[PDB]
Amino acid sequence: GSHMEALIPVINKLQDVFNTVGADIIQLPQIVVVGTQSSGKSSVLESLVGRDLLPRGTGIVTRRPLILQLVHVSQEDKREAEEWGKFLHTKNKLYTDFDEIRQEIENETERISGNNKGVSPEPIHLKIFSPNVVNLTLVDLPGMTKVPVGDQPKDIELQIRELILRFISNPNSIILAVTAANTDMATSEALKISREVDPDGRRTLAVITKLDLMDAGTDAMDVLMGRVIPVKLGIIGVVNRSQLDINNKKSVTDSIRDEYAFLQKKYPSLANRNGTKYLARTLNRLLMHHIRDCLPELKTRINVLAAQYQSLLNSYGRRKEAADMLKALQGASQIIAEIR
Numbered sequence: 001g002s003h004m005e006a007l008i009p010v011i012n013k014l015q016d017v018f019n020t021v022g023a024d025i026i027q028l029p030q031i032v033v034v035g036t037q038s039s040g041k042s043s044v045l046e047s048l049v050g051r052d053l054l055p056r057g058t059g060i061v062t063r064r065p066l067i068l069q070l071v072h073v074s075q076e077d078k079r080e081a082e083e084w085g086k087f088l089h090t091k092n093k094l095y096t097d098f099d100e101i102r103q104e105i106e107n108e109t110e111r112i113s114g115n116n117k118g119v120s121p122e123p124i125h126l127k128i129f130s131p132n133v134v135n136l137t138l139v140d141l142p143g144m145t146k147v148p149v150g151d152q153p154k155d156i157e158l159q160i161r162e163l164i165l166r167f168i169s170n171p172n173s174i175i176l177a178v179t180a181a182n183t184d185m186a187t188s189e190a191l192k193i194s195r196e197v198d199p200d201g202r203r204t205l206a207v208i209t210k211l212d213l214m215d216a217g218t219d220a221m222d223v224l225m226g227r228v229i230p231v232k233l234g235i236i237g238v239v240n241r242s243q244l245d246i247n248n249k250k251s252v253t254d255s256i257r258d259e260y261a262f263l264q265k266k267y268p269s270l271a272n273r274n275g276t277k278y279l280a281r282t283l284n285r286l287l288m289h290h291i292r293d294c295l296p297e298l299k300t301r302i303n304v305l306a307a308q309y310q311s312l313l314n315s316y317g318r319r320k321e322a323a324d325m326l327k328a329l330q331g332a333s334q335i336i337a338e339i340r
């Protein structure tokens with residue numbers, strides 16, 4: 001078919017097929033989530049999933065990317081359960097218990113790295129099927145910590161920043177920069193590190209969290225009217241669960257009802273272009289458009305790489321790297337050709 005609706009599932013397959021080195025070479029069209037731990041980055045993800053999912057962990061032994069693939073289903077595809085998960089690493093094991101899914105994410109972050117570091121580029125590959133999600137994939141990267149002017153940035157913090165730079169240097173990456181509204185957004189760590197690859201914010205969309213927790217005598221009006229933050233793909237404000245709400249087991253679904261009430265109350269002029277449902281629809285539309293726009297460049301580069309890996313492999317008579325890569329490119333090429 002020619003469907004815009006087939007584009008996300010196609011890149012979903014290429015994300016499963018390529019290892020981290022392969023993925024760097026292919027430059028896939030995808031959204032990379034960049035923020036501080038204190039940005040509420042995690043609560044943005046859970047808000048799009050429609051329930052809690054991520055390890056509530058003080059510190060992570062080995063911080064890794066999460067490739068989170070959200071798939072919309074009808075209420076009549078029940079496994080019975082209307083919502084379930086799969087990981088690439090547990091093949092076709094279906095997960096109906098979301099606590100079990102969270103534990104499996106924690107388990108995978110407890111693997112010691114191939115090196116001796118608290119960061120690894122090896123992503124956790126998780127797919128969620130649900131009637132309550134839009135069709136959307138996000139590559140969530142380990143959160144930064146803002147280093148107070150004069151403090152010495154820790155080794156682990158430099159490693160988290162190198163990993164972010166590795167992912168967002170993908171020219172076909174869209175950067176979802178997350179910043180709390182209760183912080184100096186001019187000095188956002190998310191926006192600073194994004195400018196190291198995207199100086200004019202051409203491929204950067206800003207999410208502002210914690211609109212409710214702003215210092216009294218300040219508001220988000222200027223930012224949400226698009227007059228402050230230099231990015232080009234849009235500014236969306238959200239109100240997620242506070243660290244209190246989480247500790248109190250407040251549901252994501254109820255946090256969203258309370259978010260819409262707040263926006264309608266305080267920001268009625270802006271409510272229809274902000275909040276969780278609008279972010280979800282916006283990101284779905286943006287990713288579909290981005291993949292459509294990148295697909296011919298992707299198809300070309302996949303065919304040129306196949307020819308180049310075929311040629312290197314023929315040159316031999318190391319060979320395992322080349323051979324696996326060539327096999328993965330040949331599959332990628334066939335999957336892309338099934339479109340128009």
Ligand SMILES: Cc1ccc(-c2cc(N3CCC3)c3cc(NC(=O)C(C)C)ccc3n2)cc1
Nearest residue numbers: 021025300301302303304305306308309310312
């Ligand atoms: C550590 C490490 C670093 C780099 C590679 C690597 C290998 C490549 N060759 C294909 C046969 C091997 C390669 C090819 C590229 N060609 C193109 O973009 C075409 C589309 C112009 C682009 C980047 C490439 N990078 C592998 C390991």
